[PDB]
Amino acid sequence: MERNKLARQIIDTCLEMTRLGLNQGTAGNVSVRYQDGMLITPTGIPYEKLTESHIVFIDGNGKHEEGKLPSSQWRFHMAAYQSRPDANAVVHNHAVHCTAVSILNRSIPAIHYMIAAAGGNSIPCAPYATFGTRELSEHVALALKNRKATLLQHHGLIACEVNLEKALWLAHEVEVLAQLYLTTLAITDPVPVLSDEEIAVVLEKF
Amino acid sequence: MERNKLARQIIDTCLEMTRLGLNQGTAGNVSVRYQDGMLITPTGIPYEKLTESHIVFIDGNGKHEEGKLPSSQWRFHMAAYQSRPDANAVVHNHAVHCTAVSILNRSIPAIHYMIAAAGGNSIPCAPYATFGTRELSEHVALALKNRKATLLQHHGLIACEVNLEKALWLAHEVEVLAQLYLTTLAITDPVPVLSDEEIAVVLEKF
Amino acid sequence: MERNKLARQIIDTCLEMTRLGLNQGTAGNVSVRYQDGMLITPTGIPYEKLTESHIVFIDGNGKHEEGKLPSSQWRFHMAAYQSRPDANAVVHNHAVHCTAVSILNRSIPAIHYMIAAAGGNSIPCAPYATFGTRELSEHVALALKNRKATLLQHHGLIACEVNLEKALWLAHEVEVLAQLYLTTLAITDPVPVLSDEEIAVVLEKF
Amino acid sequence: MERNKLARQIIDTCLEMTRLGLNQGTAGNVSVRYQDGMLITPTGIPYEKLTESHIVFIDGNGKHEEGKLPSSQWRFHMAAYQSRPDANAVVHNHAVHCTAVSILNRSIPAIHYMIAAAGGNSIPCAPYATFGTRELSEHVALALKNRKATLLQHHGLIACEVNLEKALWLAHEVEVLAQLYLTTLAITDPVPVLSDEEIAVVLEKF
């Protein structure tokens, strides 16, 4: 749990994200909680050229390491960390099904019991704000108060968890739920969902 | 047909399942009939870290090997084995098209002649029950009385056959039929199907 | 252009077909014109275990080599060869989009100028008949009189050309046209098409 | 920035295009600005057999190197270069989602903020004309006056940028926007879009 070990795992997560077909447009950024701030992917540099020394450290004040440019979305990574003290890793991407649901400005309801992996009976959709602004950060902070993942309207997805492996797994599961939702919504609306009682049982079971 | 040979084939089936794009969310579990019970994948451990000694033996009583945790869905694997004496292998996954049809709570009708590979003119959909419960097991046992594969409402798919190779092949074919069904259902409802007479001819031919 | 060279190319075409995502369910079969009949893939044997000596020779009478089982669909390969003297290779598969259009029992109209690669302004759909019957063969023979590719209702696709490389390429293009057609049909029906005049110009240009 | 270095990058872009799933039907062609004209992919030769010496030089007059056949679509590559002096590379393909939107004859509106990567609030659709004609070239030239990418009705996509890496990236992003658009259009029409004000802010921000 030295910086370089953590930097490699961020890079592995970027590669795995592309392998899984979640990083379309090379839009993602990945971060981990570190010291008083976080380690995050840099802006510009394509994922396949990424090396350990490219990873940027941003402190609690928002001051980033000299000579390195953090992702343009670093601020809502910091907002997730402040809003969810238990989160140690954050994954952001523009997975197509998630982003399509975020264009409809819909929450994903409990169409499958795995919806409870994000903490409740839904995956919310935070209202649009211009990328990189404080206003976007506030909407994300509010949406993550009681959920580990959120859609961002007209934009994409943020998922947070205790480590990169779970954060990536969660992100992937939300993309499956989004695809399931869009496929059934094209047939019938509304889509059959599981009741709050049933989801309370599953949550207790998890 | 020693335990280790069977354990390797289970692991190969998990890998092949992911290769085929049926194991989305890393939700599957695979088992084979063995001695008085079965060998099944363990809970927790990601598929790529899976080794022969991770595979768990569960006897006829439901007692599992000391120090190993069987999949959380072991019970409906045991229900399939008791309901279908001819089954020697069972594959479960959350393939997206199958799961989407299971959310509509629909059976897949005879939209293609390959529907007869599961034993009749349809692929049923068993009613939802909380994962891991006896009630889920009963619905699965009933649905598999005269079919080798079934959807599970709000959940996924179970397919069983005489060996892992056929069980995987069947699972894959049901996922193709599910995709075919959802694609045509978005255009027209109902979907044209083949008649019972035609399917009786194909069954006789198989 | 010895038998073994031709047998390798058939096997390569099976692999390439799977690479392209056209061979879903391991449903395809591939043949080439040879001597007085054809060389075709065998029934049963999965594609990845396929070796040169597995390829079966079937003569003009329909008598196949001793000790080898030709694909269960050999008859409509022979029907294509008799109907289209210019065809030297035939590819059959159950590509999902093609098969979904074949379930609607629709012809694919001229939604794109590449429709002319199959010889006219459409890709027809031959009426269903039980697999392996003479009746299926007659429908295929009629549909291929003035087209190099046809859908088969409730079944899949047949594409024929001057060599395996073009036959595979054609099969792939029809699968793209099928996907294009289904995607736009879910939005609007009918789908805008190019006129007969325009297609006559493109045909002249090819 | 010798010819051979540029020829390798064209070939790498063809391979990458196929990797990304944008080159379906082996329909693409790629060019770069060079000397008084351009280097472009040849007609006929499949991408995987492509070697540096296959790449064709076409001058400003349209005269191509002796003994080599340029892509059949070279003319609208030349039209892009004359219309957009800043473009140094041009990518053309028949990506399925783009082509499906081009069959509807629709422009893609601002359903996502990444729409501004092509220069405005939309991705236009140029009216159909027979491939390889001067009339097709004029429509492309007009559509690219204030956009870096355009759909071509009943045909596919053209994307242009300052280098091959950005041109490919742009092409890929337009394919994601096309898929997003088609997925949401099947659910609701019209699709929610971002306002002109919002897009002006994002453009200023880029």
Ligand SMILES: [Zn+2]
């Ligand atoms: Zn983003």
Ligand SMILES: [Zn+2]
């Ligand atoms: Zn399950």
Ligand SMILES: [Zn+2]
């Ligand atoms: Zn077939």
Ligand SMILES: [Zn+2]
């Ligand atoms: Zn083209």
